[PDB]
Design a protein around this ligand. Structure first.
Ligand SMILES: CC[C@H]1OC(=O)[C@H](C)[C@@H](OC(=O)N2C=CC[C@@H]2c2ccc(NC(C)=O)cc2)[C@H](C)[C@@H](O[C@@H]2O[C@H](C)C[C@H](N(C)C)[C@H]2O)[C@](C)(OC)C[C@@H](C)C(=O)[C@H](C)[C@H]2NC(=O)O[C@@]21C
Ligand SMILES: [Mg+2]
Ligand SMILES: [Mg+2]
Ligand SMILES: [Mg+2]
Ligand SMILES: [Mg+2]
Ligand SMILES: [Mg+2]
Ligand SMILES: [Mg+2]
Ligand SMILES: [Mg+2]
Ligand SMILES: [Mg+2]
Ligand SMILES: [Mg+2]
Ligand SMILES: [Mg+2]
Ligand SMILES: [Mg+2]
Lengths: 58, 240
RNA sequence: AACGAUAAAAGAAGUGAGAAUCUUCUUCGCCGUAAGGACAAGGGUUCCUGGGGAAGGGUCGUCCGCCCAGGGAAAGUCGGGACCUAAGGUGAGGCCGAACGGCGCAGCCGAUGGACAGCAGGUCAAGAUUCCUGCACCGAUCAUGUGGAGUGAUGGAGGGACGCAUUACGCUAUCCAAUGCCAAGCUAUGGCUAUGCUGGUUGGUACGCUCAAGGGCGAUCGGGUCAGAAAAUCUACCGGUCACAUGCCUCAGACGUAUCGGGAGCUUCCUCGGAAGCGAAGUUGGAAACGCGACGGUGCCAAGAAAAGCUUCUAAACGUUGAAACAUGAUUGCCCGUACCGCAAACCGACACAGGUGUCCGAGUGUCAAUGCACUAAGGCGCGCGAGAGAACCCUCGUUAAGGAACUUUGCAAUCUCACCCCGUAACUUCGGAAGAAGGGGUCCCCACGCUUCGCGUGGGGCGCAGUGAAUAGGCCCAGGCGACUGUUUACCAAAAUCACAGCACUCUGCCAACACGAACAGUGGACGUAUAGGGUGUGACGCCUGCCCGGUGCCGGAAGGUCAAGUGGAGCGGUGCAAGCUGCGAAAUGAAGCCCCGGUGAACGGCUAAGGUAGCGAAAUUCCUUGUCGGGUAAGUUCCGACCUGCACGAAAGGCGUAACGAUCUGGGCGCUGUCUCAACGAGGGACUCGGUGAAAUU
RNA sequence: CCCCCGUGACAGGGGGCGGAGGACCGAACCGGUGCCUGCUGAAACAGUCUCGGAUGAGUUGUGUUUAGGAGUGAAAAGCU
RNA sequence: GAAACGAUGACUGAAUCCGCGCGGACCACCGCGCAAGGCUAAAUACUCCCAGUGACCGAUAGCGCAUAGUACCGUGAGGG
RNA sequence: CGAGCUGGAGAUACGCUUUGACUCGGGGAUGUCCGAAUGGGGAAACCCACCUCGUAAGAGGUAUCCGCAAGGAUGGGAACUCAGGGAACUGAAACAUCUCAGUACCUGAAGGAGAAGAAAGAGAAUUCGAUUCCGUUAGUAGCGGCGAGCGAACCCGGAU
C-alpha cells in the first residue's frame, strides 16, 4: 500500500509541542525620517519613496 | 473477361460458425454454368473461348449456340476454340456433346453426369475427373464414378463426352501459408493444441493423444457415417 | 507529499481596491509532416459583444472553455432526404413451432459505394460554393418563334461495371533562380552607394484561322428464328462489302485578345486605432505530383459489388389540324445539416489528465533520395504556482589517469560501430544465398582542364586536432540446442522451444453428402460446390528414412452357433357365480439391432504376457549415481564443445536423424570498446533544503 | 523476351533487358524486445531510450452479424 | 403398490332402458347415478384509487422521497 | 356561491368583477405531434406520398384480422383469477427416489372480480341433493429411500 505509515495518532500535547518553533517574528519597523510612515531597515520608505533623497514615484 | 453474378462470401448459417475454418480470399464473381443443357437440343454451338473461372478448379468454355444465346460450359480436356458442339439424343459421341447414357457407348469416358433427368450435372465436375460407362441394364446404366464406386444411373440422364479439363492440380504446390489464405482461413487447428474444455483431444502436460475423436463426440479413422436409405438399391459395390 | 513533462524568460507601459500571473509594446526561447491549417465523429452555445468576479482554475486573478444578459448560425447548385442498390435488416402470400415466437421469394429498409447543376472575389464583433457583387449552370411550368410530324413502358438490349504491380509521353497545382519588371526608402559600424538591401511579380470568364502531348472510335446492306416472355427498326450470332499508316471525333494544358477580379504598397480622417479611397509590375530560365490528360501501356493470378440515372428498342396507348427536339423570354426553386471545439483544456479516458482518436493539406535551406535529420517561413506556442539556494541522497545527463569484464546469475547497463562512394570478402549451401561477411581506403576549401547534369573525374594548391567537421547513424566473428522459413499468442508479470504454416498421411463422405446450427418432416451453412471436392484426426519446409508386436481396447469385416426386448402365442394355475360367463396370473416356441465368439487392422488407442528396439542418436530441453571418464579451450572450466556407452528412464509421422537460410529464441567462446568493475572523482540539469501562495494520504 | 559461347551422359554460362518477392533498409502506421523510470502514477498498464513488422497470413474507417455451458479463439481456458 | 376412478399422446374402437357408469384388484348380490352439448347471479380473492380510524412513525424514524424516481452512477437491463 | 379575483410564485405592469367574476358541481366544444399507432417510411415525437371535397387557406380518407353488413378485435392495467410451460439453492445433517413446489419466473387470456356449477356425484344412512367460501372433523384415515417428511374426505356447524 503506502509503505511507512504512522502507528498511533499523535496526542494534542505532542502535536502542539513540535509547534513551539512556528511563531512568526514581527518586523523591526523603524520610523521614517521624512514622512514618518514606518519602513524596513535598508529598504526605501514605502510612503514618501525616500532613501536620503526621494528615489521612487509617490 | 465476361458477364455473370456476384458470389458474396459467408462461412456461418442463419446464426453461428457451422462449417469450421473458411474466411479469407479474393473477391470472385459467380459465373452461371450450363449443367442441364437440354433446352438447347438440336442447336449447334462454337467454342468462342476457354476461361479462368474461380469457384471451380475446372476450366470453363464460352459457348455460342447459333441462335444468339451465349452460355458457359465446363471445358473438357481436349476441347479447343472453334470446335463445334451440339446437345440431344440426335448428337454424336464426340468431345463436348451432351447426350443421354442410352446413346452413350460402353467404356466411353464421360463427365457432367446427372442423377435425375433435368436437374443438371452432379457427378465428375472437378478437373481431371471422369465417369466411364460400364454397360447398360434395364432403363438404367451401370457406371464407374471418380471414387471407384459403381452406380445405377438411369439411361435417360445426360452426360458430356471426355474427361474434365484443368489438366491436373499437381504442379500447383501452394508453397507458403497465404496461398491457402488467397482462398480459405487458417484451417486445421489441432485439437491436441486445445484445452479439455475446447475439444476431446485437448489437455494433458505436453504433446499427446488417447482414443481418436473429432471436434464433437464421434471417432474419425474408419466409421461408416452413411445412413440406411433408399439410394442403396440404385448402387453396386461401395469400398473406395 | 505535491501543484501534472527541464519548450524559458526579461523589462517597460497600462489597468485596477488589489497585479509574477489580465492588456499593450519590444526582445528572448520552443514546434514547424507540427506543438501550423481543413474536415469527419463526438460535444452542445463552449462562438462574438458587454458585464461579473462566490465557487470552478492545482497559486493569483482585474482574466477564462467559468457566472449573467444580449446577439450570431442565411444554400436550386456543398453533404443528406424528396433517386439507387451492398452486407445486413424486414417481409402480403408461403414454410415450421407448447406459448412468446423461428424462418422466408418478390418487394421494401439500409451508405461505408453509384448518381447528379457554381465558379471568382467582397465582407458582421461573431456565417459564407449559403449573404452582397460579377458573370454562369440545372430541372420543371408556361408564353413566342422555327420544326412540320410522332412520342417511344412496369418489358428487351447496350451502358453504368470496378483487381493487384509496374510504367512511356504531355501537363498543371506548386517551388526555385536572376544585373527581367515594378514599388519603397535608406543606408553610416571598416567597406558597399548599387550590378546593394527589402517586398510584390496574375485568378475567374468570354471570344479567338495560334502552339498542343495524350486520349476515344469501325460504317452499311443482309440471313436464320431455333436467342433476348411476346414484339423491335434495338441487341446477340453467321455471311457479303471499304476496315495497313492514315482517317475521323474530343482538347489536359499553354499562348493571344478583352474584361471582371485581385494585387506590393501608397493616401485621407480617426473618439488610439480601425474605417474609407487609390492601386505598380505581370519577364526569362529551371524543377515538379499521389492531382489532370485518361477507361493510356505492359505484366501478373489469388481472377477483381449491385441497382438506379443514362443510351437504344418495340407492347399498350393517345396521334397525325395543333409532335418530339431546338432557340429566346418569363416564372419557379421544398426539408434537414451549416456557430464553435475537433491529435484536443470543448471528443473517450471521475480531473483545464504526458494515454487514445478516421481522412486531407503540410512551405524553404542543406543533406543520393525522403513526409528522415538539423535550422527555419507562414502560423502557433513558452505547457495556470512563484522565488532563492547550490548539502546528504535520488533521477536524466557530460567527461574521465592507469587498467579493461578483473563486475556479475549473465558484458545487465552503457560505450565502441554508424551515411554515401571505391577496393575487398571465408566455411558452408537448397546454388538464391550466407554478405553490409570479415577487412581497407576515400570524404572539407580553392584553382585549372576534361566531361551526361543538382554534379562528377583527373591534376596542382590550401587550412585545422579533426572535413557524413553539428543532427539523423550496423559493433563484428566462432561453435552449439530448439524451431525449417514470413507470420501467431497469454488486453494488464510468459513472444517462446507455444499456436499456425507449405508439405505428408490415415480416414469419412455418390450428393436432400458426410458434418454442423436449430422449437422444427422449418430453414441454413458445407456448396450456387460434386471425390483431382468437402469433413475430421495427426504429423509439420527439404533430404535420407519410418522397424518389431493384432494378446487387451477401439474400428472394419464373418455368422454356424449361444445369449437377447416389446409383440405374436396361449398350454396350464387360480378367484367368484346355481350357471352361461366375467375375471386375476400365466409357460414352451417364435421374435431385431447389440454382446459373447471368428478373422483383419499401427502415419488405429497402445506395447518393446502379443512381442521384447530395425536404422539412426545417446551423460541428451531426456542421465538418478554425476562435477561420469578422457580430450579440447582457460593461469585455473559443476557450465560449454568433442569422443566414449553403463540409455535410473532415447528411437522412428505422441515421427527418428540431419540440414543451407531465417530468430527482439536459448547456451558457450573470441576480437573490439567501455565507469560493469579496481575505485571512484569532477561537472551539469530536475527534485530534495529555504521563503511566500494553495495543501492531500494510507495509518491511528 | 532478344542476342553471344559450348557439346565429351551432362547442364548451362555471358551480355542486354525486364521489373518479380508472406525480399532487404527505413518513416508515417501497426507492434511491445531489454533496461531504467513511474509504483497514494502525468497514466487502474504509461514514459524516455532500445527493439519487431513495414506490398502483406498487411493496416484502418463507417455499416452490420454471432453471447452465457453460449459466442469467438493462427489455442493463453485468451477475449466476450 | 393388491391401485380402482378421473385425465390422454399412440394404437384400437361398445352397448340403447329385460340398456349404460360407479361403489379402491376382481366376481356375485345389494345400493347410488343418466357421460360423450351449452349458459348462469350470490357468498370468496385483491388494493392503483377514496374515506375513516390507530397503547403506528415523527426527520439516521416513516415510503426510496416532508416529495425524487430527481441529482448522481451505468453502453444497457438496472441502481439511486 | 355571494365579493372577490388576476395558478405554486411569494414579482411589477395590465386588468376583470352584484348586467354576478373567482372557486366548487355537472355536461359540451377545442384537443398539434409521437405512442396499439393504423397511408408508406422511420434511428418515438420525424421524413415522404396518393385519393376525395375545397376559394387558397384548410377539412376528411388511405393498417391488418372476423364477418353480407351492422358491429366487434389489436394496446394498457398495482395486486387478485384461470390456463400453456415450469426451476434451483434448500431439507433428507453426504445423495439419486423423495423434498423445496407446481413455489419463483416466463407466456396466454380476462374481469371488477374470476374460477367453479346443476350428480354417469358424495358414501353405506336403501341418508344427501349444483358450486364456491369459513369453522370442524384432523395431524385423523392414508402416503412415504414406511426415511426426511407429506397429508385428505364424509358427517356435523356457518356465509350464501
Ligand atoms: C506495486 C503495488 C502493489 O504491491 C505489489 O504488487 C507488491 C509487488 C507485492 O509484493 C509482493 O508480492 N512481494 C513483496 C515481498 C515478497 C513478495 C514477492 C514474492 C515473490 C516475488 N517473486 C519474484 C521472484 O519476483 C516477488 C515479490 C505486494 C506488496 C503483495 O503483498 C505481498 O503479498 C505476498 C502474498 C505476501 C507478502 N508478505 C505479507 C509476506 C506481501 O508483501 C500484494 C499481494 O500485492 C501484490 C499485497 C496486496 C495488499 C495488494 O494487492 C496491494 C494492494 C498491491 N496492489 C496494488 O496495485 O498496489 C500494491 C500495493
Ligand atoms: Mg433476405
Ligand atoms: Mg524552483
Ligand atoms: Mg544564507
Ligand atoms: Mg549434433
Ligand atoms: Mg520459429
Ligand atoms: Mg519472427
Ligand atoms: Mg511553503
Ligand atoms: Mg529500426
Ligand atoms: Mg532488423
Ligand atoms: Mg431533529
Ligand atoms: Mg416516486
Amino acid at each position: 500500500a503506502k509503505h511507512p505509515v504512522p502507528k498511533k495518532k499523535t496526542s494534542k500535547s505532542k502535536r502542539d509541542m513540535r509547534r513551539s518553533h512556528h511563531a512568526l517574528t514581527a518586523p523591526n519597523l523603524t520610523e521614517c525620517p521624512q514622512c514618518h510612515g514606518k519602513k524596513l531597515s535598508h529598504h526605501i520608505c514605502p510612503n514618501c519613496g525616500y532613501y536620503d533623497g526621494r528615489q521612487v514615484l509617490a | 473477361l465476361t458477364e455473370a453474378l456476384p458470389k458474396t462470401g459467408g462461412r456461418n448459417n442463419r446464426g453461428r460458425i457451422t462449417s469450421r475454418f473458411i474466411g479469407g480470399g479474393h473477391k470472385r464473381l459467380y459465373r452461371i454454368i450450363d449443367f442441364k443443357r437440354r433446352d438447347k437440343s438440336g442447336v449447334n454451338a462454337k467454342v468462342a473461348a476457354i476461361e479462368y473461372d474461380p469457384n471451380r478448379s475446372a476450366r470453363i468454355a464460352l459457348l455460342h449456340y447459333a441462335d444468339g444465346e451465349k452460355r458457359y460450359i465446363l471445358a473438357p480436356e481436349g476441347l479447343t476454340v472453334g470446335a463445334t458442339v451440339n446437345a440431344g439424343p440426335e448428337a454424336e459421341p464426340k468431345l463436348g456433346n451432351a447426350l443421354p447414357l442410352r446413346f452413350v457407348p460402353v467404356g466411353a469416358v464421360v463427365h457432367a453426369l446427372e442423377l435425375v433427368p433435368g436437374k443438371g450435372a452432379q457427378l465428375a465436375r472437378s478437373a481431371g475427373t471422369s465417369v466411364q460407362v460400364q454397360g447398360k441394364e434395364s432403363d438404367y446404366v451401370i457406371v464407374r464414378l471418380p471414387s471407384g464406386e459403381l452406380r445405377r444411373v438411369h439411361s435417360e440422364c445426360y452426360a458430356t463426352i471426355g474427361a474434365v479439363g484443368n489438366a491436373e492440380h499437381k504442379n500447383i504446390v501452394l508453397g507458403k501459408a497465404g496461398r491457402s489464405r488467397w482462398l480459405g482461413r487458417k484451417p486445421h487447428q489441432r485439437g491436441s493444441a486445445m484445452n479439455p474444455v475446447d475439444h476431446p483431444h485437448g489437455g494433458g502436460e505436453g504433446r499427446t493423444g488417447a482414443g481418436r475423436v473429432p471436434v464433437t463426440p464421434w471417432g474419425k479413422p474408419t466409421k461408416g457415417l452413411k445412413t440406411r436409405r433408399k439410394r442403396k438399391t440404385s448402387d453396386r459395390f461401395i469400398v473406395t
